[PDB]
Amino acid sequence: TSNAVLTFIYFVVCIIGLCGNTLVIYVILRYAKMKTITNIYILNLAIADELFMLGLPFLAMQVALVHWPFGKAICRVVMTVDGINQFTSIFCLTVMSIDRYLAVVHPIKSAKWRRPRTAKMITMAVWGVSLLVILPIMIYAGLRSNQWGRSSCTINWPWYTGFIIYTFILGFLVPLTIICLCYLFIIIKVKSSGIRVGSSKRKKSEKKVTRMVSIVVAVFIFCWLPFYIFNVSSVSMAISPTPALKGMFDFVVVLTYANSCANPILYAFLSDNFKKSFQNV
């Protein structure tokens, strides 16, 4: 029962991660704000999070009867797009938090840099950094068949321990240390304006909707932290293979695919236009 129901967990992520997220691509393209700065920054995070869950049913078809259903060149490219749809969906969380940092903390000096021409140049440049960090997967996208035969999809070792700590820096720690700064400096400059200099009694706002600024890291760390702990526990201290650990570690993969099921809700519901554009459509 450990591989039966947990494989069926992947399919409910496969819909709301790819249908609740694909309506964000609808309400930006058609019912547009198409060239404001906050809607092409939220478009890549609607693009990268859409087709990331499309790379999930190949891995979901793995872990049921565990083996690679192809084990071929096409299985070498599924692990090549789940590094490009996962290391730019969490760099595009990092550019939106620098976008909201420059929009709020520096409200006057922003639009000399914040213009919708170069925010279509930050959009394209963020995929370029994403290819330069996954080519250790594009090269070594190999085959291995250790546990009970039944060859699977993985990265073939030649620089074995250094892969997870490479994805720990640029995948977890640096996108969190930039979000948690750029969302902390907002909370001081909402109180330093509305309650200090040009002020009124309305300074409730720095105490009430700062819940919504701390929701985003509580999602970003409940979805991406234990998966990075389960590999660094895997590398230094070797343990015996367990059917429960085959069910535990394969249930923390889908935890990371839930982060791209919150990023359409967390970013394109609370926005100005999409609160009404989804209400209009």
Partner: peptide, 7 residues
């Protein structure tokens, strides 16, 4: 042991 997205 486990590595990447699988074991």
């Amino acid at each position: 042991x486990c590595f990447x997205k699988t074991c």
